[PDB]
Design a binder for this molecule. Structure first.
Ligand SMILES: Nc1nc2c(ncn2[C@H]2C[C@H](O)[C@@H](COP(=O)(O)OP(=O)(O)OP(=O)(O)O)O2)c(=O)[nH]1
Ligand SMILES: [Ca+2]
Ligand SMILES: [Ca+2]
Ligand SMILES: [Ca+2]
Length: 341
DNA sequence: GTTGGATGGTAGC
DNA sequence: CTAACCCTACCATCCAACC
């Protein structure tokens, strides 16, 4: 069982570089401008030139301009990156039909039937990197291992423009030696709980009682972590089926005023419903980000598919329910559809 | 006990 | 307006319905 993983390098900014080659070699920051004030919003991503100075995903645009005023700031053009991505996903399809598109910039290939061993896998990695480079001028990082998790870790260890194999023996080693915080699915909350327990390595999860581990991090995470330490993790590559689709937007200013919010909600519904594309949802959720960045939601599941009109009426009601039950002003409003027929 | 709906937490993009 | 966007996957917990 061999898995090949592809993660595109500094994706959004790299795409801007390919569109505009004069940008290459200098700092580029791709931004989400919220319109609340001059330069309000956050960085979506930046090239390596900009990361050298601390500019990266998630920081505020003004914070990036403070620490890097002369960089090139461009607005996130989501659709453009999606088009480049799709073309790249189709190139990858010509290498294995058995492909899991896992996000805007990454995919898993099961190549067990394409190659005999890690060596040939490494070589396909080379051919894949070159082809994506011929056709789209985009550099990627390849990770190759026995499963999804270690193929992801391998690519993380090689970024940028790298390729890395983690073979059966280094999986053993990594189980004993890799900091557990570095395992995909282990964020800052789980990391801290593990530290208190004195669980630092995957191997450590085999020397603690399940109930005690499950009591701290929850069942599924405990199962997942143990499965990896036992080297019995084998989740198959599966065709990507979206479970929810939606849209969220930032308001000019914070409001508790239904009439001042409505236009944004409706903008989010039109865009959401368009992205459904023949998919018919049975659930709608209105999502509100409050003044203090708390995420709050109200939803409804129908026994039947929701029409655009039903979505219009229900989300207004659902918004009012948020206003009824939470006293805070709202800052971002959106809508999410799930449970596709 | 099972399934699943409402809502929130965590994670990573 | 004074920093904090976009999008999706998955799970936990608190309850209700089933039977
Ligand atoms: N709006 C927004 N977009 C994000 C965020 N994080 C990532 N993205 C988008 C932009 C990225 O280019 C793309 C892929 O995310 P990655 O984590 O793989 O980062 P990226 O490819 O830019 O860096 P890479 O060289 O792996 O390190 O997803 C975020 O916090 N907000
Ligand atoms: Ca990625
Ligand atoms: Ca990437
Ligand atoms: Ca981590």
């Amino acid at each position: 069982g061999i898995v090949l993983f592809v993660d595109f390098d500094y994706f959004y900014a790299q795409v801007e570089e390919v569109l505009n080659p004069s940008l290459k070699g200098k700092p580029v920051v791709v931004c989400v401008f919220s319109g609340r004030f001059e330069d309000s919003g956050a960085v979506a991503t930046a090239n390596y030139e900009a990361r050298k100075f601390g500019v990266k995903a998630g920081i505020p645009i003004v914070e990036a301009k403070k620490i890097l005023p002369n960089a090139v700031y461009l607005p996130m053009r989501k659709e453009v990156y999606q088009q480049v991505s799709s073309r790249i996903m189709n190139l990858l399809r010509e290498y294995s039909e058995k492909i899991e598109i896992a996000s805007i910039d990454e995919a898993y290939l099961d190549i067990s039937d394409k190659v005999r061993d890690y060596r040939e896998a490494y070589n396909l990695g080379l051919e894949i990197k070159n082809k994506i480079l011929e056709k789209e001028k985009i550099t990627v990082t390849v990770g190759i291992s026995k499963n999804k998790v270690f193929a992801k870790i391998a690519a993380d260890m090689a970024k940028p423009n790298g390729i890395k194999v983690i073979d059966d023996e280094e999986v053993k080693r990594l189980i004993r030696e890799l900091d557990i915080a570095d395992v995909p699915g282990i964020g800052n909350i789980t990391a801290e709980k593990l530290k208190k327990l004195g669980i630092n390595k995957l191997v450590d999860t085999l020397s603690i009682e399940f109930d005690k581990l499950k009591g701290m991090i929850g069942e599924a995470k405990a199962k997942y972590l143990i499965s990896l330490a036992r080297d019995e993790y084998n989740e198959p590559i599966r065709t990507r089926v979206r479970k929810s689709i939606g849209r969220i937007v930032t308001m000019k200013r914070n409001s508790r005023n239904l009439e001042e919010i409505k236009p944004y909600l409706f903008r989010a519904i039109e865009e959401s419903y368009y992205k459904l594309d023949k998919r018919i949802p049975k659930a709608i959720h209105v999502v509100a980000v409050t003044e203090d960045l708390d995420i709050v939601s109200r939803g409804r599941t129908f026994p039947h598919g929701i029409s655009k009109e039903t979505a219009y009426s229900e989300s207004v009601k659902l918004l009012q329910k948020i206003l009824e039950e939470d006293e805070r002003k709202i800052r971002r409003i959106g809508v999410r559809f799930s449970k596709f027929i």
